[PDB]
């Protein structure tokens, strides 16, 4: 992060050991379940590109996913270099990624007037690569999520919406999926109950109606 | 949260990694037992809508419950947009929910004079959705809570009042329930002891009288 010194200078605060250990635990245990991305975004609040790189470098497992993340960051940096032709100096994509910029340049940009928020720009490129990884690490298609003959509709709904969150289709497609597949893939009892509610039923109405099945 | 900078500016403080981990543990383990809502409310003291969204997004399980929560937040935001027609700018319901507002706008409202407390307004909509989830995740009707033939009256009272807390009827109905069902559903020994105390007996008197049964 960045902190104001008692002398009034813009100063780096290192990402704490407990914040790094929390991130390492999250990536190691949750293995790109979708909640990894909100947790990354929360653990990297106000992070410089050096802090973001520290988080990504400290991941020991999943090195294929980290290579896909690096490839995404590189094509996002190249796209920035395309969209922002070269003339504080203006940062190149490699400067935003923190490969060709010093920590002092990063803080110089992030505290400029107006700020050039290279930490947030880079964090967008990271999250945009984690999106692809979470989508790929999703173990099932939403079309594969079907309710068991004796499975509670609540457990099926949990599986369905966790899969829908990982697959991360557009909202119009998620709307079609929750309207159509969630009913269609329910077991015959629940499917019978749910059709009786009509197409306008909310998820709370559906889960209430199926709560005893 | 919000903090005053040494320069006197209103500044964001990120929700700490340990506070997020505490919330994630609470939702994962306690699975919308009613104490989840006081714990949410305590962990989100002074939270901006961005902090509240961070807490809700970091929940990995229970995605059906999180969809019911999102649906509640959306109808509360729509009700705000109905009750507050559009003319610092005034926040829309999507701004209070932190979907169409920046963190800087959120802090601008929360530190205005008078403040527009969009974090507390949004936290009310969240708690109001968690109320519905806790009521739905209640495993038993209060009518189903009956004392076993050899069950201690204290364990039955614990089950009864935990169910009464989750079902969260109005106070007049809770009064009728604790007056009527708690005696009626006691086992025949306790039910005999409790009727002898008359209708005015307090719970401490009831639990004392049944303490040896």
């Amino acid at each position: 992060p960045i902190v104001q010194n008692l002398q009034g200078q813009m100063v780096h605060q290192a990402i704490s050991p407990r914040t790094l250990n929390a991130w390492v635990k999250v990536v190691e245990e949750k293995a790109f379940s979708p909640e990894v991305i909100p947790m990354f975004s929360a653990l990297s609040e106000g992070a410089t590109p050096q802090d973001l790189n520290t988080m990504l470098n400290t991941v020991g497992g999943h090195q294929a996913a980290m290579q896909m993340l690096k490839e995404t960051i590189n094509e996002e940096a190249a796209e920035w270099d395309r969209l922002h032709p070269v003339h504080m100096r203006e940062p190149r994509g490699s400067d935003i990624a923190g490969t060709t910029s010093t920590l002092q340049e990063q803080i110089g940009w992030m505290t400029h007037n107006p700020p050039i928020p290279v930490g947030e720009i880079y964090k967008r490129w990271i999250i945009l690569g984690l999106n692809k990884i979470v989508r790929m690490y999703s173990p099932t298609s939403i079309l594969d999520i079907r309710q068991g003959p004796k499975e509670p509709f609540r457990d099926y709904v949990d599986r369905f919406y966790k899969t829908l969150r990982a697959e991360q289709a557009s909202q119009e497609v998620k709307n079609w999926m929750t309207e159509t597949l969630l009913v269609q893939n329910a077991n015959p009892d629940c499917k019978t109950i749910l059709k009786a509610l009509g197409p306008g039923a909310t998820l709370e109405e559906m889960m209430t109606a199926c709560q005893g099945v | 949260p919000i903090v005053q900078n040494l320069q006197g500016q209103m500044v964001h403080q990120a929700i700490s990694p340990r506070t997020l981990n505490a919330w994630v543990k609470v939702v994962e383990e306690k699975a919308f037992s009613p104490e989840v809502i006081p714990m949410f409310s305590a962990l989100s003291e002074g939270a901006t809508p961005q902090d509240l969204n961070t807490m809700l997004n970091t929940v990995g399980g229970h995605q059906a419950a999180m969809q019911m929560l999102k649906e509640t937040i959306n109808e509360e935001a729509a009700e705000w947009d109905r009750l507050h027609p559009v003319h610092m700018r005034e926040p829309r319901g999507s701004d209070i929910a932190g979907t169409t507002s920046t963190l800087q706008e959120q802090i601008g409202w929360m530190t205005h004079n008078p403040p527009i407390p969009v974090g507390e307004i949004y936290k009310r909509w969240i708690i109001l959705g968690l109320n519905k989830i806790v009521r739905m995740y209640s495993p038993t009707s209060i009518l189903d809570i009956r004392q076993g033939p050899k069950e201690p009256f204290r364990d039955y009272v614990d089950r009864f009042y935990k169910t009464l807390r989750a079902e969260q009827a109005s106070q007049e109905v809770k009064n009728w329930m604790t007056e009527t069902l708690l005696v009626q559903n006691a086992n025949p020994d306790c039910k005999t002891i409790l009727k002898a105390l008359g209708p005015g007996a307090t719970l401490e008197e009831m639990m004392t009288a049944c303490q040896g049964v």
């Binding site: 979708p34 909640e35 991305i37 909100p38 975004s41 999250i127 945009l128 999106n131 692809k132 979470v134 989508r135 969150r165 990982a166 697959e167 991360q168 289709a169 557009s170 909202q171 | 809508p49 961005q50 509240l52 969204n53 961070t54 809700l56 997004n57 995605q63 999180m66 969809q67 999102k70 937040i73 929910a97 932190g98 979907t99 169409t100 507002s101 920046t102």
Partner: peptide
């Protein structure tokens, strides 16, 4: 490209 995993807020 995927829409992201942020159920709540501004993604």
């Amino acid at each position: 490209s995927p829409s992201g995993v942020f159920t709540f807020g501004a993604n």
